Design a protein around this ligand. Structure first.
Ligand SMILES: NC(=O)CC[C@H](N)C(=O)O
Lengths: 93, 449
């Protein structure tokens, strides 16, 4: 098309179960999620205290194609690694 | 550089308003987000001629680079004014942003409404059913009482004074119907693309004398959008209110024990305080508090902290419970609460007995619309009828809610982050609520077992 779809950039916090959770597996499983209109971006592991680190990961979504509710629920199916997800920030593009 | 106070701003407007270029320009020239990418494109821009470049061209390339997924910085964006460090949201069009605006972290202190000046684009942006009006209504309902209007694309209407005046008139009508007082609102003619009246004053409008706003102490005037943002009035932070800390997560850490994590919403948490977790009513001492890399002597409103407590298992407290000070208005579960509900546009009508999920702070609980007590005039609160039989889009109503699971909430007047909520249904937020009253509250642990 000559005109582009509406997009948002979202930073997700993905929290582990404890300080021993395999974080590389956790982010690999997030990045394996494929949805039309979803682009994974940069990520870092960020200390939150007491030796726990959260995954902070960017993604870019086409508003009309990618439900953020659905994406969070999908990430949370990795119950062996993921305790919860939260939206750290989000912006229009 | 001097020490700054912190404020939150949300930027709203129609897809053709240019609000992303406008917000991007402020962050570029007054902040430090994705600066390595900025620097890459400033150098690349030499290719367009002999070295000169437009900020808007760099912003366009930064946007494309973000779309590729290869920029580094997260979506938490900030910039400086003389007085403030501003955390800014260029409001997404995403429909899941509505819940995030209601229950997400930090309400805005000021909304900035960006208006396209062109004739067709202006009219499109003030539609009663448009996303822009909904964002404005949500901000107003949530207590964002400060507003700035920027009339963008002034180049496209040749910086014509009459056109600006007519836009100000029509936009004043638009925002008054939402509920804002236009006399308190600066109207700034800008060009987000060319920088006019963004950080430096325009030379394209000799008629332009500046913006003004009435405040409680007098009339404040300026020329630029940056000046209007700097003139945002310092909000009061709830440092001295009693502690409220809704839980996001709870960890069991070997050698440490139970570590709840959450945002301090009101009050302050310190090692050595005795705290209570609602709705369970477990009480214990705070052993230590940590945030990011540091151990804290106190966590203050806005801090996302972990803290270690003893004699509480990870199984007796959970996400959505609320931690507060046992010594100072401790939090409690409720039997019911009454709230003013604003019904958003959605394909339905609401009768007593409706039981959707409510999101309130970190709680996610289905609550019955037990009684529809009043319908009200939205802006004034005046009661229009007792016991309406249904609610439709646009209605404001007092509703009695009964939570389906134990739930800790507060009146919005007392603890605002625990007194606003989103109602979810049909894959959208269908209503926003502001809590007006709460009906708050032994079984031994041996007896429970
Ligand atoms: N002038 C252009 O469109 C090129 C933009 C940028 N310098 C790039 O190579 O991606």
């Amino acid at each position: 098309p000559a005109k582009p779809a509406a997009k948002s950039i979202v930073t997700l916090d993905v929290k582990p179960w404890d300080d021993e959770t395999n974080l590389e597996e956790m982010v690999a499983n997030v990045k394996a999620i494929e949805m039309e209109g979803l682009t994974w971006g940069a990520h870092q592991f960020i200390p939150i205290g007491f030796g726990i680190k959260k995954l902070q990961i960017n993604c870019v979504v086409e508003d009309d194609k990618v439900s953020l509710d659905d994406l969070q629920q999908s990430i949370e199916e990795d119950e062996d690694h993921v305790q919860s997800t939260d939206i750290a920030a989000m912006q229009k593009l | 550089g001097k020490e700054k106070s912190h404020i939150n701003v949300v930027v709203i407007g129609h897809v053709d308003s240019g609000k992303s270029t406008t917000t991007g320009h402020l962050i570029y020239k007054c902040g430090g987000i994705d600066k390595r990418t900025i620097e890459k494109f400033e150098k690349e821009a030499a290719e367009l001629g002999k070295g000169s470049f437009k900020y808007a061209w760099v912003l366009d390339k930064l946007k494309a680079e973000r779309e590729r997924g290869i920029t580094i910085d997260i979506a938490l964006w900030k910039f400086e004014t003389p007085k403030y460090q501003v955390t800014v949201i260029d409001a997404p069009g995403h429909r899941d942003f509505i819940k995030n605006m209601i229950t997400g972290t930090s309400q805005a202190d000021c909304a900035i409404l960006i208006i396209a000046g062109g004739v067709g684009e202006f009219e499109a942006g003030i539609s009663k059913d448009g996303q822009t009006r909904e964002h404005a209504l949500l901000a107003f309902t949530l207590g964002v009482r400060q507003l700035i209007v920027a009339v963008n694309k002034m180049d496209s209407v040749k910086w014509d004074e009459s056109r600006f005046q007519e836009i100000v008139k029509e936009t004043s009508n638009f925002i008054k119907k939402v509920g804002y007082n236009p006399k308190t609102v600066p109207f700034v003619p800008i060009s987000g693309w060319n920088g006019d009246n963004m950080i430096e004053a325009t030379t394209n409008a000799p008629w332009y004398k500046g913006w003004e706003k009435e405040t409680k102490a007098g009339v404040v005037k300026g020329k630029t959008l940056l000046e209007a943002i700097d003139a945002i009035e310092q909000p009061s932070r709830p440092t001295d209110k009693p502690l409220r800390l809704p839980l996001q997560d709870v960890y069991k850490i070997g050698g440490i024990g139970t570590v709840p994590v959450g945002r301090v919403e009101t009050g302050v948490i310190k090692p050595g305080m005795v705290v209570t977790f609602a709705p369970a009513g477990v009480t214990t001492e705070v052993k230590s508090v940590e945030m990011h890399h540091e151990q804290l002597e106190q966590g203050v409103p806005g801090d996302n902290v972990g803290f270690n407590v003893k004699n509480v298992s990870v199984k007796e407290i959970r996400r959505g419970n609320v931690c507060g000070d046992a010594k100072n208005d401790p939090p409690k579960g409720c039997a019911s609460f009454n709230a003013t509900v604003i019904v958003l546009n959605h394909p339905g009508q609401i009768s007593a007995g409706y039981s959707p999920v409510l999101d309130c702070h970190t709680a996610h609980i289905a609550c019955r619309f037990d009684e529809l007590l009043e319908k009200n005039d939205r802006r004034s609160g005046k009661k229009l009828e007792d016991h309406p039989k249904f609610l439709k889009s646009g209605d404001a109503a007092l509703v009695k809610f009964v939570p389906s699971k134990p739930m800790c909430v507060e009146a919005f007047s007392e603890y605002p982050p625990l007194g606003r909520f989103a109602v979810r249904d049909m894959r959208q937020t269908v209503a926003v609520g502001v809590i007006k009253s709460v009906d708050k509250t032994x079984x031994x642990x041996x007896x429970x077992x």
